[PDB]
Amino acid sequence: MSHHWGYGKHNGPEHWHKDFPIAKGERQSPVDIDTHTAKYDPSLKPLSVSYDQATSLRILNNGHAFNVEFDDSQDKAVLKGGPLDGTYRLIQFHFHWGSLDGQGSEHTVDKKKYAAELHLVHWNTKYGDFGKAVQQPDGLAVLGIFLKVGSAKPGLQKVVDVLDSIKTKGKSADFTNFDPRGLLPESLDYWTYPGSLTTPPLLECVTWIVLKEPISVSSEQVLKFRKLNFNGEGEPEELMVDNWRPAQPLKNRQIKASFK
């Protein structure tokens, strides 16, 4: 039923459970990361992020966010190591962000909300494609990276500058040769836990890997995110803001830390 849901009073996160009852499941995302109770796990490995051959193809306003899509038909941009068994291939990235700098992230850190959160979505190659992977408990690995407002992120500007061409729902643009290495912080220290997609269909198929170090973006860069629209061309303007799901109950889960 993946239309009719969105980020408002009458169709936002508190209503999703009527169409998608797994919304109240046992391993929903995002969560608050309580840094004091996350366990350092010396068995966790460094994360291996291998994006040197990533081939972006296109950027799309899907009406909830915008997606930068990658050709995932070959063995190219891969996440492995960390808490993962096997290899996961990059399919898309997107962001969640606020109406104001004080909110926007989906995960929180000791209840702190960041201005935005980047999700690099990868599927486990043992399942052959994304659509089969999402039906499995180890099907996806999502690398989450917080954004704070400060210095500009130069590697983000090619994204920001294309947004006026995909202002409205359903618009796409060639978006080739974008290098997602330019969106990564210096450290790959992370927290990890088992969870879910944060939008409908809310499937419980994700190993979450959330980096501790945020990236900085400028006020001007996030302001351009907030000029996007959730409506389609020729409809009344609803700014694309506050496209985040709040933290969900941790229930029977442990968050592990790769560090300290």
Ligand SMILES: NS(=O)(=O)c1ccc(C(=O)Cn2cnc3ccccc32)cc1
């Ligand atoms: N925010 S997040 O990183 O957790 C996230 C990642 C991916 C998606 C989709 O692919 C949603 N979606 C879009 N089409 C789909 C077909 C099958 C299953 C899911 C599908 C939704 C949320």
Ligand SMILES: [Zn+2]
């Ligand atoms: Zn997301």
